[PDB]
Symmetry: D2
Subunit: 248 residues, 4 copies
């Protein structure tokens, strides 16, 4: 388990090459683990993708709303709640793995602490229809490891768009204005990829799907020392009737 | 008339040195904005143009709702007024060929602006009204467009110009989303009364979709460079909604 | 009485919202400038600081003309005043530990600013006077520097700050010129009286060499972040305190 | 010789297509710069060897040391040796290749406009040859639009000698604003290896070579061409320091 990942990473990374990833993580708020920079063995990834497949078919929940705390940006997708995913022993132990968190802490350059609100530890988003999107937003917590389990071709949409070095003002998000002042980075993803995101200071969204395509991710959210008290009444993934949500 | 008036308006607000700085920005971004800090036409001239356009819209508005295969099937959801209709405006047509207007902007393009383009693309009015209306990602067939931001929604409703300079249009392989993955997007917010010069052939651009029923109106004056003086694609959707490259939605 | 007046000076100019915007710029560029549009200290306070430094310069300036091996043999061609001389100044030393100043700037760093650094690096004055004087490409050992641009030449004479944020310092392989080949350089012009906050550990930086015999004078207040505590100093490259440090080479 | 164009046309046809040249044209407009390295050779290795050997003989015979400041570019230094255009034109190979219809035709696909080999006779060709610590080609623009630069010999990147570039700028000789432009714009640094070639948009790209940090050799050949916008142009500035060390704009 841990011993297999410790050996797997030891053959694919050096302190020097991980320091280069830390540069790119702080510069873009984003670092991708693809065929050239794998993070988990293919067996470990298949097991997690299989467990997520059983969880989607069993507990998927449609969402279609505008979130007021992010300028009424849309959330049009299906979700599997954190409390359901936590029952997967595989996903639960892996998210708290001392080998995994220790390795990525060399990229964040600060302690990764698996202590977040129990409704936000894990989240699966499953998009299926044209115009499905995870609109522009920030996270309440500092870190997220995103598993790009199933990604459509880039021509169908689903790319991550990001503006790093921003912050979330839930009473004045200024999202389109911040786009007008800042260059947007678009990150294309392939199935099997993973990426680490600095969610609290990186404004981000997924580009809306142009046709009916399948886009599935797993979100493992972690805290830094900086993450306190939650606010906004905007927990739309856990509560579709949240005060900040406006149904569509 | 307007030429002698425009020449004096520009001479009080620009030097060759400051035009050269605009030429820097126009080559760097494919875009230079004529806002309240850098006016291009007197307020009376724009009011005349906008009034002519609002009549052309009220009379000749033609709704467009399609996908364009030559630009990766990006949408065109708007109303248009065709060039032949707009060319009936003596004002818009005369202004678009003004040797004072073109001579000034040629200090920004650093090359001759030639008012010799196809008779169906000399002028275009687009007019977005409903949620999700957009002028999707595309290039122009010609080098230059002077865009009149006659009416702009508030930025929180969308309608911003997004642009990626230093690209080109391959109609058999546009690679729009792949180009976005490789390049940074510049977003240009626009207020009513703004104009901007756009390098349309090498700047991939779109307008951000309307997040709510809002009004977004522009006039497009398209010009050629010496490099533009044979068309292809079968994709002239604004003049012909039944173009071979237009798909239905 | 410094902290009481400084807190008023800052409360007139800054809000949590405006500081958050500065924190965004500080994270993005490794650098936020406190110029005429964003003053940090009252003019009478900076004047007092600058006169302390000119006295220290007149009494304790030492010429440095060397290359540093831990930063790719980049030059240090300047005069300096050592930290232990500057710490004798009651004004500078107490200001550098001001809970009001450090508390304010911590809203830009978004983390605690800790005035616990090596006694040979709490303060540094660099004083360049001659053509080709430069503070060559380098990083700092600590996270933070507040730089007082006490005297700046005209921009056409050089002396600008050049910076590449989001980098790191490997003293055995600093890769200075290779990093410049892979990254864009931000040049920051400074005027006399400016101050700026610098993320010194992850921002590769230098001062553009003087093209004329002009005078360029700064005060460097260096502080630690939590990450810097307990960590060990390596490199044998403390050239400002020891001109014949092991990593220093003749120029 | 004589059969150089027939072979060069084949060499390019093996490596380049209109689609792939169109990608290079996008980079050239964006950066003012496109590099021909091992992944994208421009000329056969035998042909570059002949050009380098020609340049080595021209250097040993006709080099001239320069150490000055140029006022039309803000007193930035020129600290190097040079070989002037009239001496380089005596090489039948270099002079023929610089007007090659195959070479110019190919590069015109990257410039997206005609490349015209009609420039001032003192500026058709230039070899710069740096040898000593602090040697540099200081920040400047060119009077003409295009230059193909042959990086015949380049030191290790740790020793300096990289190209730095700020594209989408302009040269005002009475007020060049070198350091002000650097404050407003990001600097692109382009490292080079011996054997590389690159195309540069010299009239709108502010550029220099990073000063050598120690005694190393850095040797380039500069083939300068015009665009239509440079034709019948009045040369101004009195700053042609490579031809005339006593040029009015030059300062010792
Ligand atoms: N706050 C985010 C949701 C976080 C999902 C769980 N980490 C948003 O506005 O969409
Ligand atoms: N080529 C443009 C149309 C421009 C018409 C006016 N210049 C498009 O596909 O949207
Ligand atoms: N590390 C710096 C010296 C900083 C001393 C004051 N913080 C250098 O090598 O130049
Ligand atoms: N204008 C350049 C010289 C270019 C000569 C060769 N094309 C300079 O000032 O250094
Ligand atoms: Cl258009
Ligand atoms: Cl040159």
């Amino acid at each position: 388990i841990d011993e297999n990942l410790a050996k797997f990473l030891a053959e694919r990374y050096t302190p020097e090459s991980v320091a280069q990833l830390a540069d790119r993580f702080h510069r873009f708020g984003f670092v991708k683990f693809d065929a050239a920079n794998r993070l988990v063995p293919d067996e470990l990834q298949t097991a997690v993708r299989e467990e997520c497949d059983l969880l989607i078919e069993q507990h998927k929940e449609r969402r279609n709303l505008l979130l007021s705390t992010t300028g009424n940006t849309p959330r049009r997708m299906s979700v599997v709640k954190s409390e359901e995913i936590e029952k997967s022993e595989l996903i639960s132990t892996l998210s708290r793995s001392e080998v995994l968190l220790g390795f990525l802490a060399g990229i964040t350059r600060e302690e990764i602490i698996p202590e977040v609100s129990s409704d936000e530890r894990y989240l699966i988003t499953h998009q299926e229809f044209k115009s499905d999107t995870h609109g522009w937003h920030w996270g309440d917590y500092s870190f997220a490891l995103i598993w790009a389990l199933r990604m459509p071709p880039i021509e169908h949409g689903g790319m991550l768009q990001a503006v790093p070095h921003t912050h979330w003002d839930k009473s004045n998000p200024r999202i389109n204005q911040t786009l007008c002042e800042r260059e947007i980075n678009t990150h294309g993803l392939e199935s099997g990829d993973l990426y680490l995101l600095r969610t609290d200071t990186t404004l981000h969204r997924t580009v809306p799907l142009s046709e009916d395509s399948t886009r599935t991710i797993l979100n493992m959210t972690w805290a830094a020392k900086r993450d306190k008290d939650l606010v906004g009444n905007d927990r739309w993934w856990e509560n579709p009737e949240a005060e900040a949500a406006r149904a569509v």
